[PDB]
Design a protein around this ligand. Structure first.
Ligand code: ACO
Ligand code: ACO
Ligand code: NAG
Ligand code: NAG
Ligand code: NAG
Ligand code: NAG
Ligand code: NAG
Ligand code: NAG
Lengths: 533, 533
């Protein structure tokens, strides 16, 4: 018995009905019934036949008995199983009245509760906090980036082998999905904050364009050579290299938004601040040509995804392949993004095993961070640029900045509610990390606005907290990222586990590895070593 | 047919003699005859039986036919085989006179000459040189260390799969063996050069001892955690960790010689220089107490190796195990060093596969850099300290320093000749890297004295060469070492080879990797980034 399983042995007593047991989870959307076990017929009178099977306990189970010769369903039960439990399903015949078939399930051994280590760890963290309590840079931006870094290091090392510290298979939001867009939002803000400071004191655009180009080139080089390939399985060879990647995506969106802001730059007006609703939206109207291009790119993304003809697959398709959507479309994982990507780069230059495979059973390859999602990344980086413009235009009165942050958060939350139709698998556009939906960027940017609204009158102005954890990694992000990608298997971060089937046994190791990375970040702050790409 | 092999098919014509073919290489010392092929008897008249076998071409071959039923040797031939050649051995019966058995060997396909890429590469290097031609630091020490670093990076990546760019199996000296002791000699010199400068300007011994201790601790930590374990094969676990290592050895010898010089330090006498033979050996007589301890440690090493009783093995044994020494002692790879090491640390905490295994066929484990060789490392580091004392005592006249270097080189060369008895496998103490012989340290220190004698009136005084290659890696040694140990499988250094059986195909890749490391060292010099443990 492995993790998230429960031995289910079935006893069948009926004289002459050879039985089939089917299975399907409760979360899987429009999924066919596969097979679990085929119990044998009662060989002799009063000596029932028995079979053994294993059922997953991560989500609820639907179990169907359907016979072998015929189709009439003998029984169905829908129930939820706990980890490492002897459960006993009995199917019998009811003597009273007409002949009837009934199923009774009895627990032999009780299961084991699995959220106890999470509870214990979070109370111990609260107790430790209770014992502990008794060209300027901006503190709030650095604090938020540090929180994103500790979440990324913890989730990428290991979630404790938990399903809610892991990317969802399709059409869902978890703790793991939240981390990546916030980096893009911070990156756009940092673009505006750096660029306004360099253009002042005297500089040339010809000077700055080389810097932008060189940064983009270096990021594209670092991702392909170092981060992507697995160098334990063999020497690197072309026709087997993965070109799409996270650093290439960051580099291309950085190049586009940086050049686009550099072309249309205007000096910041003095005494720009006014009372609320009396500004005349001067921050908005100073960016008049650059909004139009972003609208054209979003119109292109909508039109391409919904209306492009694709051979074999339906023309606009958002669902998974394989078993999902009833196995009518057994390829078509990507849709119109997958066809575009599988006509230019190739099919061998893509990520072989996607997240959707484990539940939806899709054979064909998909890349989470490839082509046609870059447009939405540019849109969200522009939103971060918009936040950065707000901070430097109106920084006389605190009340003004809070009003803009509140209004922007409410309007983005309203559009993401209206598009999502407040569900998970329904609506015009669902929220999905793999396709980089407009709903996805629209819901996480509102959370970023709310988090900045909470932090700014505490960590940055009129201090009530020193923000002491979470800016020490914030200053050095690229060292931490390359460090955990290169040094992942080394001894202080990882060691051999003498029980491989415990959530409890993994969680402490991942927590210690995250704490060690925070300690390394703290040592480098005191030694005043900062590296910037 | 793989590298360094040659297909040898044998034709036997005799009517009734079933034959055995034996094999033994020409370099292997007191080695038994194993089996190569068992050809079958002539089944019919005039229809000879045939067999196929492969013979290695790295060294010469001795081939014996000895029959199966009896013992009378049918024939023997001793010859040298070339790579990838059809050779044809015929054994027949001579009709004339008495019955006689003769063997004739005829070449069907000529072999391929294998030193052509080395010749081509070294002429191309000469042609490139011909095209190219038309608290102070000391330059000569840095230049010598850089040469040692490029040799170490080239040999450790790959020798071109050549036997003379690789450690010898036992009792031998190659290009690969020379690299490591020179680092210890440079290290001892750098100890004296730093220590005399820090004691002047005002300092305390209590201040310096912590620095020495901290450096030793860090080196011991770096070697065990990072350099030794192979982290692709599994997570690290104790009872399977290798404690002996190169960095631990450097750390312990550094601690001993640094503390020993710090205890007995005396200020450098002004106007110490004199005419040759008129100094009264003042450099020698200022170190009077510290010579005695080194003599006691060397006496301990000699007495322990020659006279310690060891169970099962002979009491003082220097030979290999397995097949070597005629298979009389089938264990006893280590001797009295192996027993001492296999009684303290363990047998699981040792290096599993030694260099001697491929030719001598030894099953038992040995560690090249463990316990009881540390004493000789301390002796050679003290010799480097002695060279450093010569440079600062007598640096008024150049002629004086040259006379001391010449005399020291001649006396060490004379002792290493007298001990080695100018042979390879004979003498009282042979030269061996694995046991760290007195002969080994005595012969390489003389070469270090000669190389310093050549470099010092050229690179350091009265320049005729700028030493432009070989000091750029010399300043940063620890970064280069940790860099090639961690980044060994990455793309610019290594790539997939579409022919795996060519010396020519490997050599270019290793040369390019060495040149890239020299380029990285050059970039860091201009950027003025220097790190010191
Ligand atoms: C599921 C997953 O795996 S999610 C994967 C995502 N995780 C990653 O780590 C991806 C890698 N990304 C990164 O490391 C970072 O996002 C970066 C470094 C590439 C960019 O983030 P940035 O905010 O731009 O960082 P960085 O510090 O390099 O910023 C560069 C400039 O911004 C400036 N800056 C940054 N923060 C601030 C601030 N708070 N105030 C003012 N200026 C700032 C810097 O001074 C610098 O300007 P300069 O070079 O002109 O002096
Ligand atoms: C087969 C194989 O694999 S062989 C394996 C061996 N190869 C290796 O790379 C092993 C690793 N060893 C090393 O990297 C080096 O030997 C080291 C760094 C550990 C030590 O070598 P060192 O000569 O001591 O190097 P390093 O530069 O660190 O020397 C430290 C001190 O010497 C001083 N120094 C070094 N060279 C000189 C010089 N020419 N003149 C004056 N001072 C010098 C430095 O200034 C420093 O003094 P400070 O810290 O007080 O300012
Ligand atoms: C089980 O039987 C039901 C009803 O007869 C039928 O609808 C269903 O397709 C069957 N399941 C499978 C997997 O054949
Ligand atoms: C409970 O599980 C164990 C697992 O080995 C099994 O042997 C035992 O038969 C189960 N109990 C019952 C009543 O089946
Ligand atoms: C797509 O589905 C077909 C069956 O309709 C299958 O044969 C094919 O192998 C699938 N594609 C891949 C890449 O496996
Ligand atoms: C081969 O025969 C010779 C002479 O009869 C004998 O000395 C030798 O031991 C034999 N070799 C082997 C391996 O038996
Ligand atoms: C030469 O080598 C080839 C290798 O395939 C072999 O087939 C051929 O028979 C050899 N020549 C002779 C004359 O045996
Ligand atoms: C040492 O030799 C004996 C045979 O004499 C052998 O059984 C043993 O396994 C050898 N040692 C090792 C470690 O293999």
């Amino acid at each position: 018995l492995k993790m998230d399983q429960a031995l289910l042995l079935i006893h069948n007593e009926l004289l002459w009905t050879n039985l089939t047991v089917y299975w399907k989870s409760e979360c899987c959307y429009h999924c066919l019934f596969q097979v679990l076990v085929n119990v044998p017929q009662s060989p002799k009178a009063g000596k029932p036949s028995a079979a053994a099977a294993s059922v997953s306990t991560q989500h609820g189970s639907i179990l169907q008995l359907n016979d072998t010769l015929e189709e009439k369903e003998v029984c169905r039960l829908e129930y939820r199983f706990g980890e490492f439990g002897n459960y006993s399903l009995l199917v019998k015949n009811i003597h009273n009245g007409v002949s009837e078939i009934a199923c009774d399930l009895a627990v032999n051994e009780d299961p084991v509760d699995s959220n106890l280590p999470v509870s214990i760890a979070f109370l111990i963290g609260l107790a430790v906090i209770i014992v502990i309590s008794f060209p300027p840079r901006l503190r709030s931006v650095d604090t938020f980036r540090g929180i994103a870094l500790i979440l990324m290091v913890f989730v990428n090392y290991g979630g404790g082998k938990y399903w809610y510290f892991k990317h969802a298979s399709w059409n869902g939001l978890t703790v793991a999905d939240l981390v990546f867009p916030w980096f893009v939002f911070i990156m756009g803000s940092s673009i505006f904050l750096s660029m306004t400071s360099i253009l002042q004191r005297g500089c040339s655009k010809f000077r700055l364009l080389g810097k932008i180009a060189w940064r983009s080139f270096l990021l594209i080089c670092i991702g392909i050579i170092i981060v992507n390939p697995n160098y334990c399985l063999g020497p690197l060879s072309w026709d087997k290299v993965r070109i799409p990647g996270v650093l290439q995506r960051l580099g291309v969106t950085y190049f586009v938004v940086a050049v686009l802001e550099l072309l249309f730059a205007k000096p910041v007006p003095e005494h720009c601040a006014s009372e609320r609703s009396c500004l005349s939206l001067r921050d908005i109207t100073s960016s008049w040509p650059q909004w139009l291009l972003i609208l054209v790119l979003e119109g292109l993304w909508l039109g391409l995804t919904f209306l492009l003809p694709v051979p074999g697959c339906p023309t606009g398709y958002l669902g998974p392949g394989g078993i999902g959507d009833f196995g009518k479309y057994p390829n078509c994982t990507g849709g119109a993004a997958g066809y575009i990507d599988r006509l230019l780069l190739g099919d061998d230059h893509l990520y072989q095993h996607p997240s959707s495979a484990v539940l939806y059973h899709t054979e064909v390859a998909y890349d989470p961070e490839g082509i046609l999602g870059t447009i939405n990344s540019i849109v969200m980086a522009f939103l971060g640029v918009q936040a950065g413009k707000i901070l430097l235009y109106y920084k006389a009165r605190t009340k003004d900045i809070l009003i803009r942050f509140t209004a922007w958060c409410c309007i983005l939350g309203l559009i993401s509610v209206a598009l999502t139709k407040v569900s998970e698998n329904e609506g015009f556009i669902p929220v999905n990390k793999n396709l980089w939906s407009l709903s996805y960027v629209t819901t996480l940017s509102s959370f970023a606005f709310f988090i900045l609204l909470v932090l700014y009158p505490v960590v940055d102005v009129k201090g009530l907290w020193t923000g002491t954890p979470f800016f020490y990694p914030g200053m050095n992000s690229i060292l931490v990222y390359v460090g955990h990608e290169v040094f992942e298997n080394y001894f202080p971060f990882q060691w051999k586990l003498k029980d491989n089937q415990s959530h409890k046994e993994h969680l402490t190791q991942n927590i210690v590895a995250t704490a060690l990375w925070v300690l390394i970040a703290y040592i480098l702050y005191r030694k005043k070593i900062f590296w910037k790409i």
